[PDB]
């Protein structure tokens, strides 16, 4: 060994230039894609909002026009995924995890336009789903494309350019360049075997994709919540009790997304017409919920600050949470193209805010601001349920800039990923690839 | 291997409760260690100042005690390292890294004392060394010690408590939790084969250590630089330019320290008494420079807010950079106990600072603050000399809280690591472990 090691070192971090030059373009192409995906999504939500004004008098007529406008786009989505590309339903991150293991196919001629346009109908109709699964999938398929297009040879070239695509695709969905890289590193790489994924090339990928998002979005941020207060050391245990509550709830929610995954498949039995019709009813209900209960529908970025600043009552948080618990399953267990990453953040924020308001009334001697428990809890579902605490924290950190809370954040994050292991939970993104290799 | 995977996926992240409890006590010790080490280095450095005042009349007499007290503490720490633990010289990160390839032993009965006290000698005398090297190596061995004591078995617990040690070790050196966890992942782990390091454990390690640092060090931050300006998109191109500069200079630096080792070994040949004598020589010089040109000596963490704020001349920045490169080589190539990480920040800052100054006086259409070009190049020598940019980026992020510079910080880093790779450059820590294994 010792001989084998010495010349192995001498020759480390020498990623071949051709891989690098090819990693730039992947990021460039995913940014644009990701931006253009986001622009589309909004633009249709606007029409939904615009057609509400045109029928803004017959209150019964309004209920259905936002049903239909969204029922329609809901259906166009389930279809373009059933007819042309089955593996482009739901998140699609399981798929890319499988692809890295060499256990799933990368049909980019089929997925890129199915996801891109399938997503706009499920996103743009205002369904509880994030743009993350979509953009990470599109971004990897983009990365497979330039491997094909330029006929490069290797598993290094194949695994590297498939990953940077998926990393530059998560960055541009949150403006989270670090939490890009750290997702590759902590979650999606083959988790039981060594891999020739070049970190330095994943990097150049995330840089272009971010530079792309900033060209079409700058001077704006996705969540602004100010600088909240600091966390005394004699208060840090509250952030452990918070992770414990998240640690028990984490797997329960993992069960319910799997459990309900099957219970919607019973409905259509598999049949493309029983299915698309159910999804336009869900989608028609999401565009309809997003008109009476905007906080019970949609991705959920909206109510994250409106929750942090303690702008809700206790009841409204209990309500918004249980409602969203439900409308999240319906949209993702149905298998409509769209992640559960954003709609979990919203769940996490709503949860901690509730936890903070309770903490405030019990402990006036701590001079507490509930917004800190919201920021702590925001990436807490992502730690307890999909079990990527590191990526989850640096995600919330990159979107809220409350770095003084890095300790309470790190402690709650552990306190979930621990109490979730001590009660029988699973990486949901690997318990999918699990059940999707168990039928295959 | 399709069904091998399905079973591994279902069994992912279930670290043994005892290993979680054990990383908890390692962190707690590694912390208390680095806290004491830091309080220590401080007291010594302070008693050195208290002597100059008992003697401020006779200015030559002043320059004598400035020399000798460093010389005495220099020798003492050289001696302590040769007479009782020779792998505790220089930095100690290569050794802990070899300890994970199982090519180098963790002689914790010997290094814990030899590093800590030899460290307190070299650092405490005002030598150009970072308390990070020590606290990492020390932290690892503290992990090994709790292994060799509780007689826990398995490559998992050995590689893990070895890791969380070093990670909590680096955390407490810079109050940088994420930077230590990421240090293990990007750099510390064995980079040519898979491994069993429980990252969740490394967290419990680092958390406890970070807490212990906060218990003795709150309400004062290692660096407070305030909230500098943003960077508009049409200035990014200048940060990538700063990366390119470090890329060609990183490797020119690695070479010197290597050669400068040889050149310094030719001085003593191996003989303990020439070496120790050469130590107090170097040592005393730093103690002297510390009194007469203090920017050229010390750990470097001191003049890092001074250089950002635009309080140095441009001549000064050139001077400091040359002079500090000169002393940084003497102090670290000599093998004196102590790291290079903290002095490498300084050299990086002092350079990026002088870049911003020129960068301002050429492009006032851009409205530049030279402080941004320092913050970029703080984690820059950490990218082209040790090619672990994802850690320097996050490390700098932890110390300066200026997230708005994420893009140019990232960008400047990739600039240095790409050009270091391309002008024929070897990572610094690895390229040390090699010349060792070849001599073994």
């Amino acid at each position, epitope marked *: 060994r010792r001989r084998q090691l010495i010349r192995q070192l001498l020759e480390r971090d020498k990623t071949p230039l051709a891989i690098l030059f090819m990693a730039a373009v992947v990021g460039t192409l995913v940014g644009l894609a990701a931006v253009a995906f986001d622009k589309g999504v909004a633009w249709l939500q606007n029409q939904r909002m615009g057609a509400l004004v045109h029928t803004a008098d017959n209150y019964p007529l309004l209920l259905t026009v936002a049903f239909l406008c969204s029922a329609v786009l809901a259906m166009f989505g389930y279809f373009l995924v059933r007819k042309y590309a089955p593996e482009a339903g739901g998140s699609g991150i399981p798929e890319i995890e499988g692809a890295l293991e060499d256990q799933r196919p990368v049909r980019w001629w089929r997925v890129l336009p199915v996801k891109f346009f399938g997503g706009l109908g499920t996103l743009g109709g205002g369904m509880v789903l994030g743009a993350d699964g979509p953009t990470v999938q599109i971004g990897g398929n983009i990365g497979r494309m330039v491997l094909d297009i330029f006929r490069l040879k290797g598993d290094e070239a194949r695994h590297t350019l498939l990953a940077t695509g998926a990393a530059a695709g998560l960055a541009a969905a949150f403006n989270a360049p670090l939490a890009g890289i750290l997702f590759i590193i902590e979650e999606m790489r083959p988790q039981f075997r060594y891999t020739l994924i070049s970190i330095k090339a994943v990097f150049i990928g995330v840089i272009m994709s971010t530079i792309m998002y900033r060209i079409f979005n700058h001077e704006v941020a996705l969540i602004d919540v100010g*600088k909240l*207060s600091d966390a005394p050391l*004699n*208060t840090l245990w509250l952030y452990l009790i918070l992770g414990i509550i998240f640690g028990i709830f984490g797997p329960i929610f993992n069960k319910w997304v799997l459990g309900m995954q099957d219970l919607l498949h019973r409905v259509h039995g598999g049949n493309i017409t029983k299915w698309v019709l159910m999804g336009g009813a869900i989608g028609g209900l999401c565009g309809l919920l997003g008109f009476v209960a905007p906080a019970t529908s949609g991705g959920g970025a909206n109510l994250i600050p409106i929750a942090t600043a*303690g702008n809700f009552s206790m009841g409204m948080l209990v309500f918004i949470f249980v409602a969203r618990v439900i409308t999240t399953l319906l949209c993702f267990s149905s298998g409509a193209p769209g992640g559960i990453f954003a709609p979990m953040l919203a769940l996490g924020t709503v949860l901690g805010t509730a936890f903070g308001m309770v903490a405030v009334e019990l402990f*006036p*001697q701590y*001079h507490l*601001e509930a917004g800190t428990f919201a920021i702590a809890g925001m990436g807490a579902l992502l730690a307890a349920s999909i079990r990527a605490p590191l990526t989850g924290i640096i995600l919330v950190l990159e979107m809220t800039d409350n770095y003084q809370l890095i300790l309470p954040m790190i402690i709650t994050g552990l306190g979930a990923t621990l109490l979730a292991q001590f009660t029988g939970g699973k990486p949901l993104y690997s318990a999918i690839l699990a059940r999707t290799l168990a039928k295959q | 291997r399709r069904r091998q995977l399905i079973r591994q996926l279902l069994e992912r992240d279930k670290t043994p409760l005892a290993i979680l409890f054990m990383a908890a006590v390692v962190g707690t010790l590694v912390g208390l260690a680095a806290v004491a080490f830091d309080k220590g280095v401080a007291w010594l450095q302070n008693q050195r100042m208290g002597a100059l005042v008992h003697t401020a009349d006779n200015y030559p007499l002043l320059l004598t005690v400035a020399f000798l007290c460093s010389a005495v503490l220099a020798m003492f720490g050289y001696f302590l390292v040769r007479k009782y633990a020779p792998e505790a010289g220089g930095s100690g990160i290569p050794e802990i890294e070899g300890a994970l390839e199982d090519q180098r032993p963790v002689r914790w009965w010997r290094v814990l004392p030899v590093k800590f006290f030899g460290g307190l000698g070299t650092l405490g005398g005002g030598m150009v060394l970072g308390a990070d090297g020590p606290t990492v190596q020390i932290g690892g061995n503290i992990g090994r010690m709790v292994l060799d004591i509780f007689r826990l078995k398995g490559d998992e617990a050995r590689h893990t408590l070895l890791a969380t040690g070093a990670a909590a070790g680096l955390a407490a050196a810079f109050n940088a939790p994420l930077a230590g966890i990421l240090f293990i992942i990007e750099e510390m782990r064995p980079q040519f084969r898979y491994t069993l390091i429980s990252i969740k454990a490394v967290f419990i390690g680092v958390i406890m250590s970070t807490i212990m640092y906060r218990i003795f060090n*709150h309400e004062v931050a290692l660096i407070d630089v305030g909230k500098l300006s943003d960077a508009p998109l049409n200035t990014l191109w200048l940060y990538l330019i700063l990366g390119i500069i470090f890329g060609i200079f990183g490797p020119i630096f690695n070479k010197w320290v290597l050669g400068m080792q040889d050149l310094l070994h030719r001085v003593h040949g191996g003989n303990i008494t020439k070496w120790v004598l050469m130590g107090g020589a170097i040592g005393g010089l730093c103690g002297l420079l510390g009194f007469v040109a203090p920017a050229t000596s010390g750990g470097g963490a001191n003049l890092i807010p001074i250089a950002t704020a635009g309080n140095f001349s441009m001549g000064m920045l050139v001077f400091i950079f040359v002079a500090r490169v000169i002393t940084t080589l003497l102090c670290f190539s000599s093998g004196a106990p102590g790291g290079i990480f903290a002095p490498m920040l300084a050299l990086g800052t002092v350079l990026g600072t002088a870049f911003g100054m020129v960068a301002v006086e050429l492009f006032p259409q851009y409205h530049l603050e030279a402080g941004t070009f320092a913050i970029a190049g703080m984690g820059a020598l950490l990218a082209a000399s040790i090619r672990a940019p994802l850690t320097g980026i996050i490390l700098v992020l932890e110390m300066t809280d200026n997230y708005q510079l994420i893009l140019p910080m990232i960008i400047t880093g990739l600039g240095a690591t790409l050009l270091a790779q391309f002008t024929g450059g070897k990572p610094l820590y690895s390229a040390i472990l090699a010349r060792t294994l070849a001599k073994q």
Partner: antibody
Amino acid sequence: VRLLESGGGLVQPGGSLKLSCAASGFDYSRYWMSWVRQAPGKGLKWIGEINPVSSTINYTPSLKDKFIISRDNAKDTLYLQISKVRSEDTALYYCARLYYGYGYWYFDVWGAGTTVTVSS
Amino acid sequence: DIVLTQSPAIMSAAPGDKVTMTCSASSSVSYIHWYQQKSGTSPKRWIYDTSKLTSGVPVRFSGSGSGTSYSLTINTMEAEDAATYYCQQWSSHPQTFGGGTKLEILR
């Protein structure tokens, strides 16, 4: 870094008056301010506190609106206004900036004090 | 409300002595604070978190205690130390002050 209070003097019994504290030398927001009083020759006695965004406010066991504490971070000023005054609010009124060590909160920096006399 | 009660209302002492005053509480407090108030002056945060010294407090001062006994100690009191000292707890809202130990000087 200073605290300068004012507005004190003479009140008729049962009346009311509004004290003021002018902060300088620091971000007056991101800081809980507080009021403590001292009857002539007696000891300190907490009155009330107020978090930065005027979101949270606490008082000692007082009555309905005996005390009301305001802050207009725009002018870096704390306010206190006592009503239905009586001879035991004759006291010296201190304005303190709160803060914490481990997290058990203390009165970091106190002002000079404005003096209130309740007499006919 | 917690009632803090400080042990000698008035003590005289002569420079060079060791002087100790004591803060005792109705129930349990922890990490209490001490303020020094020299005549005609706003109180000064003097010792906090039971035993930590506000920057600028000379090392002749020290704090200690737990549970319901807390003390402040001047070790070789010097004469500029004459004041009424006040303790304060905030481990129970509403936080509450002691009632003063006025240090007089013998000369």
